[PDB]
Design a protein around this ligand. Structure first.
Ligand SMILES: Nc1ncnc2c1ncn2[C@@H]1O[C@H](COP(=O)(O)OP(=O)(O)O)[C@@H](O)[C@H]1O
Ligand SMILES: Nc1ncnc2c1ncn2[C@@H]1O[C@H](COP(=O)(O)OP(=O)(O)O)[C@@H](O)[C@H]1O
Lengths: 549, 549
């Protein structure tokens, strides 16, 4: 159904299509008129030795030809502009849809696969270029040439019709294997691209462990698979080309043979036969040219099908349920209620977890590694939806709150810090642009990131390489903290007056002054309270404290 | 030079090329023979009304054409195999070289740019194809057709020679513009791919800060540049194609005009002129097809130059000298002697470093963040070359030690952990795949990663998603510790049995039991010794201790 999207893209650009078709009509008419040059040369001028009329008629036919070139130039310009606009629209639609897909899509798929699927739009651009769509128009317009051929002679027209039927049979036979081979080679290319991206990202680890040769062998195996698919598709293309060449050449020879037979029988003159053979270039040649580009069209079709495969998935907002006047503030009691969650379909991470967080207080969540604390933090951020249960903020279900407010009023500071390629201010102004250079300074000073930025060659304007390679891991975390502080959130979640602070702590010694501490065990909260209370009743918190110390 | 590389690649294949050229010679002989059919049709059969010699001649020439198409099929298969081999060799060489470059290359470039340069080899593959490479063969073998055309008629041959000169003049002037347009479009595509990869990697941060629209605009501003470059190259191609079409059509019309004049004057006959026009397909059509293939050849040339730009950079082992023996034990006193270092051209990170680490001792390096601790660790791992300095391990220089030994006997555990897409066992076996399961289990037990691995659905075989998204971050750190422990190194470096353990710590509360503590201030060690000694000296370490606990 991607062709429906393309047609919708052609809905505003309509006068360009009409001009293209008028130019095609004029071009085809002039070519058909100029095909009679050999007939007028042999029947009238060579036979009668009319030298002067030869000169004038040849000059006139040379003049006629240039108009075809000018019209082809104009049509090619228009088609190139149309194709460029269509390709830009397709790429924007795909990218803008991908940027809002749920986190399951990004956790399941690989970066290289998505990047390759985006870059596959080059095939669509090639198929909608200025040299592949004019051939389609010529194939459509060959009806006029066929009508004129039928008027000129019925027998040779029927022979050309047999050639056309052979072309159609060949295309129908070969259409499916070609697209299957193209799909296979593009899947192999996607796998190779994923391996390439993964290898380049972790080059430091590969160098540290001396795994260059093993990585080379793995990439060599993937390249071998790619070349096997490439060879299969090349053999298919070679078979198609050989069959079409056989049909074209034998049809040309048979047409010349039957024309000679007709000329001997007196049903046609030699000039008429030559004119028919010339007009064949405006009847059969466009069709064969189209058949030549069948692999390219099929490749573009498969690429468009994959793009549509990504484009069918529902976005984050599509899976939402409602919104209302709850969008004022998230200040209140965060209350997980009978929350159950599982990642994909593995063992559940949280099993009937209930906890209430008082408003404006600094609470902390503890447990063993992998217990499901960052899972709670991501659930509070609506990155994943609980399997069953509710998460109430200020007495309102979090599903009824607009996702924009949830993402703007809750700040999550995880240890997977990401720094985008850009200036320090650009990194700190992510999603919160057009902020004056005073809030940024206040947040940087709060996050203790002011000093190292001021020590940089350009204060708050130093360009940062990809993934923050220009900074140490310590300063990168402070930049992340400052960026999250600029949000001015109602709920702040951190790893290691009226704003609620939730601390996901791994070391139990850091938090002894928290207002309330929650212990998570076996996917549920088993112990809660202050540090003194938790160490008093001699529970699992007491065991954890004694084991560590 | 990449042509030298192509010649070296083609040197082992001296049997395919000879067969290709012999098949090409036979193909051209049969194609030249067909023009004589087109001659005979209008001189002896039609004129004298021979209705049986016509059938015999037509059948014979159909047989000739069938042999010609079979030979073309065989040659195309051989050419396709040759091109596939060449492309595989090129890509494997490029990837093998890229995996060996120093860390400056990877810290200066971007993940998108390198992979874009890799995927730009598809254009070279398109250039060396089964339908493109035969066209150069036909062009170079058009010498036979030109000789026969000259033998047939001198004046029409001179007209065809003028046509070829016009083709050459046309293709000469568009060379640099087409090359520049292709280079610009490829650079813009590389930038777009870098932006795509960066956006996909950090999708979670974009979602958290609500920067979908900002990223959409940022990528739109790059898609627009790519489209502008594409439109410029499309207009250049349209101009070149229009000029080539003008030359071809006007040359054909002038050939027909001069042939008709010659026939009128009695210098030829109608059949001879038709034969000349037919044989022009083996002197002018190959040249015109080669001219029409210029965008592919130029694009492939630009891609090859882009690959060779990377291929010229020196690897790690090419910047080193000597691989002296007598060094198999990196268990001496690690010594930093007057070590100075700076990243790129910024301010120096280490200035006159002087420290010695006793062998088989657990030492700690501390200081504020950004002081140059991970820099020291990377210098020990020999990721970077210390300018104006010397690092000594036992009594030798780290420069005069095998890089494989250096990166096999020294293990570095950093704050960033990379988990490749694969099973847990395949991740613990990176670089060193030939180990028993007992050693892997022992290493996992020492790193405390055995329990959560056993709790996994398939133990040490569970597939881990890209970047270890299937596990917790706390579970990934223990996995990397086990991976580093499997090396059985002589030096172990940790970012918080005579093995030397170096602990890079940010908190002084966790290293008070270490043998010696190194404090790094202003790029040099100012305080060294034990914790008690450092407290007694009442130095900078004492101030840091008083500030926190
Ligand atoms: N992206 C993911 N996909 C599938 N499973 C996951 C993912 N992230 C975490 N898990 C699983 O959920 C559990 C909870 O881990 P997590 O909450 O990250 O631990 P912690 O709270 O200690 O950081 C882990 O055992 C892990 O196996
Ligand atoms: N890959 C790099 N490229 C350029 N500069 C860097 C790079 N890594 C670190 N630096 C700079 O060198 C200094 C030393 O940082 P680093 O040694 O990583 O800190 P730490 O010792 O706390 O780990 C930092 O201020 C940082 O700006």
């Amino acid at each position: 159904n991607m062709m429906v999207k393309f047609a919708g893209f052609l809905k505003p650009l309509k006068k360009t299509v009409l001009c293209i078709f008028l130019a095609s009509l004029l071009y085809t008419a002039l070519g058909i008129a100029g095909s009679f040059y050999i007939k007028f040369l042999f029947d009238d001028l060579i036979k009668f030795e009319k030298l002067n009329d030869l000169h004038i008629i040849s000059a006139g036919f040379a003049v006629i030809f240039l108009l075809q070139i000018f019209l082809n130039y104009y049509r090619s310009i228009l088609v190139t502009k149309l194709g460029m606009s269509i390709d830009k629209s397709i790429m924007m639609e795909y990218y803008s849809h991908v940027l809002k897909l749920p986190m399951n899509f990004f956790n399941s798929r690989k970066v290289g696969e998505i990047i390759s699927r985006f870059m596959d739009a080059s095939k669509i651009r090639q198929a909608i270029s200025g040299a592949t769509l004019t051939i389609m128009i010529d194939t459509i317009m060959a009806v006029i040439g066929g009508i004129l051929l039928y008027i000129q002679n019925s027998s040779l027209f029927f022979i050309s019709f047999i050639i056309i039927l052979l072309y159609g049979i060949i295309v129908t036979v070969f259409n499916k294997p070609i697209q299957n081979a193209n799909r296979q080679i593009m899947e192999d290319n996607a796998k190779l691209t994923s391996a390439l991206v993964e290898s380049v990202k972790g080059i430091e680890t590969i160098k540290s462990f001396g795994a260059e040769e093993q990585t080379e062998k793995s990439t060599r195996d993937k390249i071998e698979t790619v070349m096997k698919s490439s060879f299969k598709e090349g053999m298919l293309y070679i078979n198609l080309s050989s069959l079409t060449g056989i049909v074209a050449g034998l049809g040309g020879i048979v047409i010349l043979w039957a024309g000679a037979y007709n000329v001997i029988k007196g049903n046609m003159s030699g000039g008429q036969l030559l004119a028919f053979n010339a007009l064949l270039a405006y009847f059969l040649t466009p069709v064969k040219n189209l058949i030549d580009l069948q692999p390219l069209i099929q490749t573009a079709v498969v690429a468009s099908n994959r793009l549509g495969e990504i484009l069918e998935l529902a976005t984050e907002k599509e899976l939402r349920e409602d919104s209302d006047d709850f969008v004022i503030s998230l200040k209140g009691d965060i209350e997980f209620r009978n929350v159950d969650f599982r990642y994909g379909l593995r063992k559940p991470v949280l099993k009937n977890i209930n906890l209430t967080i008082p408003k404006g207080k600094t609470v902390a969540i503890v447990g063993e590694s992998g217990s499901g604390k960052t899972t709670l933090a991501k659930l509070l951020m609506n990155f994943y939806s609980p399997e069953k249960g509710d998460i109430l903020i200020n007495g309102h279900s979090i599903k009824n709150i607009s996702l924009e407010l949830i993402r703007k009023k809750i700040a999550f500071v995880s240890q997977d810090v990401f720094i985008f390629s850009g200036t320090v201010k650009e990194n700190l102004c992510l999603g919160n642009e057009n902020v004056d250079m005073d809030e940024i300074i206040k947040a940087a000073k709060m996050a203790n990131a002011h000093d190292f930025i001021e020590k940089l060659p350009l204060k708050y304007d130093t360009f940062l390489n990809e993934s923050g390679a220009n900074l140490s891991e310590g300063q990168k975390q402070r930049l992340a903290i400052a960026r999250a502080l600029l949000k001015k959130p109602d709920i702040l979640i951190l790893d290691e007056d009226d704003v609620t602070v939730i601390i996901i702590a791994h070391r139990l010694s850091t938090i002894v002054n928290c207002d309330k501490i929650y212990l998570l065990k076996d996917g549920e909260i088993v112990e809660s309270g202050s540090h003194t209370e938790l160490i008093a009743l001699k529970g699992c918190y007491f065991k954890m404290w004694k084991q560590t110390e």
